[PDB]
Structure 1
Amino acid sequence: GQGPELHLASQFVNEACRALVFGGCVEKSSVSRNPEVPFESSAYRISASARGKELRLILSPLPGAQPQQEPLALVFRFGMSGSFQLVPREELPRHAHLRFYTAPPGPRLALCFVDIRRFGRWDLGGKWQPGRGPCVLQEYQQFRENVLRNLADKAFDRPICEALLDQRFFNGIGNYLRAEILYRLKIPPFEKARSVLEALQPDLLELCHSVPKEVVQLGGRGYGSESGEEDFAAFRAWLRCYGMPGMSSLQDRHGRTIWFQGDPGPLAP
């Protein structure tokens, strides 16, 4: 996911788990190289927040739950295919690598971290990844300032399309978003990043917030009340640039495809 997907995933955990109690251990699949979660409680609640391209779960035992335990926080990065599903315990999807089991009474469910390609990670601290800048959705002013006060950084020597994937400065922006942001302003993707940002000290940094916010406001992205194909219709409709007919595409220097209209820009391959 990108920032929107991580944000909706955290909203899904919050609404779906609002009225559930979990019990027992946190089960990791055998094949996952991520760490075992050392956590057990007779009764705990699960809640979530997103920052950029990370999601933090908090495991919160109820009063008197046993064995005595403090709340535990886990931070997830989703990679290409990470997600959360709430499923009936004996219909686990394939590639459910981390499971949280509801406690009785009621229908026995599992909250699953599901990750086909296993690019996703999680860590035992609750800490956000040091080096990631502020969330473009939830920390706009901090995000904007952190870019504008570090324009000398060699990160801004690169093309604007490459700079926009640098999670030190645009935590939450990924490949579809960089195409959608740059198309809204018709900024050539291979313009020098420092050139587009010096010109700023509704601009590019504001759309780094408002464009991803639009996706959040659509809802869906796997987390909606509407069907899987229904939310996917709404998203494909909203996209104006990414993989759309009549648009150009090039490989950036890490081989990631950038979609654009018109002038590729000066630093183009």
Structure 2
Amino acid sequence: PELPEVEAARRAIEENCLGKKIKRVIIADDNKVIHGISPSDFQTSILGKTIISARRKGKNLWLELDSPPFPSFQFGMAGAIYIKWPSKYSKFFVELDDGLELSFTDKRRFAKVRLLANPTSVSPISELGPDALLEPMTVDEFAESLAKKKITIKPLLLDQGYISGIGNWIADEVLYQARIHPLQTASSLSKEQCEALHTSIKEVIEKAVEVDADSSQFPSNWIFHNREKKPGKAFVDGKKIDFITAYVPELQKLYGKDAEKAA
């Protein structure tokens, strides 16, 4: 789950779960998912409270209740929010006063659910870089921040401490759209390349959020649709897709020293 997916979950909670007292709570007895507190203490703490707002930074979601502490969700690889089982994969479950039920599931057990006095003042949220959607860097700030990073551009975009919210599919998408190879060193990007990337990040994220992360609604010219196909059967806009991370060799070339080291 990347920024769009988590944002869609946040909006869904905001539209259907606010101002409703929590009548029942079921926190899975999962030592791997439930972090920093016991399930029983977690259940006791939030019972009877109301959700005031749903917040998000990067791929992290948290619920502001009428009194702290607040529950936070680090999705992991298979985390998801459902609003109506109680699924055997539910980790966080609450029944509201109007009968509506809210659940965070994780079949893989890689998610992290916490209960914090102030989610934003402690890790992992406190260590996150600016949100790609809510706090975008300016064109010049972006170029300046890239100038001294001797890191290949894709992994840098995946560094939540640099910019938060981008995952593998968005990374592949913005680099493909900006015509930048994923192995190009950040500090080697020209001012023009930096701006092209600044633009693609804005456009891809806004479009994805515009359609509530419904990938079936992503533009057809997006590499997203075929970035998970077997080698030799992956094409976008008629051009061959290669894998290292999906990219299009004909449209994404390596430049300078990086190209030299590659060859």
Match of 1:112, SS state, is strand
5+ residue gaps, structure 1? 61-69, 222-230, 252-256
What is the CA–CA distance in structure 2 between the aligned matches of 1:186 and 1:201, rounded to whole Å? 11
Say whether the 8 Å CA contact 2:57–2:125 is kept in structure 1.
no
Q: In structure 2, what is the equivalent of residue 168 of structure 1?
A: 161
Moved more, 35-44 or 72-81: 35-44
Q: In structure 2, what is the equivalent of residue 84 of structure 1?
A: 81
Q: How many Å apart are 1:142 and its aligned residue?
A: 7.2
Q: Is 1:213 aligned to residue 213 of structure 2? A: no
The code of the aligned residue for 1:2 comes to E
Q: Is 1:260 aligned to residue 248 of structure 2? A: yes
Q: Is 1:141 aligned to residue 137 of structure 2? A: yes
The code of the aligned residue for 2:206 comes to K
Q: How many Å apart are 1:15 and its aligned residue?
A: 0.5
**Count of paired positions:** 235
Q: In structure 2, what is the equivalent of residue 100 of structure 1?
A: 94
The 5-angstrom pairing of residues 151-166 of structure 1 reads 151-152=147-148, 156-166=149-159
Instruction: Provide closer, same or farther for how the CA distance between residues 98 and 144 of structure 1 changes in structure 2, counting only shifts above 3 A.
Output: farther
Say whether the 8 Å CA contact 1:101–1:111 is kept in structure 2.
yes
What is the CA–CA distance in structure 2 between the aligned matches of 1:143 and 1:20, rounded to whole Å? 42
What is the CA–CA distance in structure 1 between the aligned matches of 2:19 and 2:111, rounded to whole Å? 27
Instruction: Provide closer, same or farther for how the CA distance between residues 11 and 180 of structure 1 changes in structure 2, counting only shifts above 3 A.
Output: same
Cα deviations across residues 57-103 of structure 1 (Å, max 9, x unaligned)? 1122xxxxxxxxx333222111111111113xxx3233111111213
Q: How many Å apart are 1:136 and its aligned residue?
A: 0.5
Match of 1:233, SS state, is helix
Say whether the 8 Å CA contact 2:51–2:63 is kept in structure 1.
no
Q: In structure 1, what is the equivalent of residue 230 of structure 2?
A: none
Cα deviations across residues 130-177 of structure 1 (Å, max 9, x unaligned)? 32101000001379737724743xxx2222122111111121111111
Q: Counting helix residues as a fraction of each chain, which structure ranks higher? A: 2
The 5-angstrom pairing of residues 214-229 of structure 1 reads 214-219=207-212, 221=213
Instruction: Provide closer, same or farther for how the CA distance between residues 57 and 39 of structure 1 changes in structure 2, counting only shifts above 3 A.
Output: same
Instruction: Provide closer, same or farther for how the CA distance between residues 147 and 75 of structure 1 changes in structure 2, counting only shifts above 3 A.
Output: farther
Match of 1:39, SS state, is helix
Of 47, 56, 61 in structure 2, the residue corresponding to residue 55 of structure 1 is 61
Q: How many Å apart are 1:191 and its aligned residue?
A: 1.4
Instruction: Provide closer, same or farther for how the CA distance between residues 211 and 102 of structure 1 changes in structure 2, counting only shifts above 3 A.
Output: same
What is the CA–CA distance in structure 2 between the aligned matches of 1:268 and 1:8, rounded to whole Å? 39
What is the CA–CA distance in structure 1 between the aligned matches of 2:14 and 2:167, rounded to whole Å? 24
Q: How many Å apart are 1:194 and its aligned residue?
A: 1.1
5+ residue gaps, structure 2? 228-233
Q: Is 1:124 aligned to residue 144 of structure 2? A: no
Cα deviations across residues 225-250 of structure 1 (Å, max 9, x unaligned)? xxxxxx45324846335515244333
Q: In structure 2, what is the equivalent of residue 190 of structure 1?
A: 183
- Taking every aligned residue pair, what percent have the same amino acid on both sides? 24
Q: How many Å apart are 1:6 and its aligned residue?
A: 1.2
Instruction: Provide closer, same or farther for how the CA distance between residues 53 and 197 of structure 1 changes in structure 2, counting only shifts above 3 A.
Output: farther
What is the CA–CA distance in structure 2 between the aligned matches of 1:144 and 1:209, rounded to whole Å? 15
Moved more, 119-128 or 73-82: 119-128
Q: Counting strand residues as a fraction of each chain, which structure ranks higher? A: 1
Say whether the 8 Å CA contact 2:133–2:205 is kept in structure 1.
yes
C-alpha root-mean-square deviation of aligned residues, in Å? 2.9
TM-score normalised according to structure 2 size: 0.77
Cα deviations across residues 28-62 of structure 1 (Å, max 9, x unaligned)? 112352133251443523521111111121122xx
Q: How many Å apart are 1:186 and its aligned residue?
A: 1.0
The code of the aligned residue for 1:30 comes to D
The code of the aligned residue for 2:69 comes to L
Q: In structure 2, what is the equivalent of residue 7 of structure 1?
A: 7
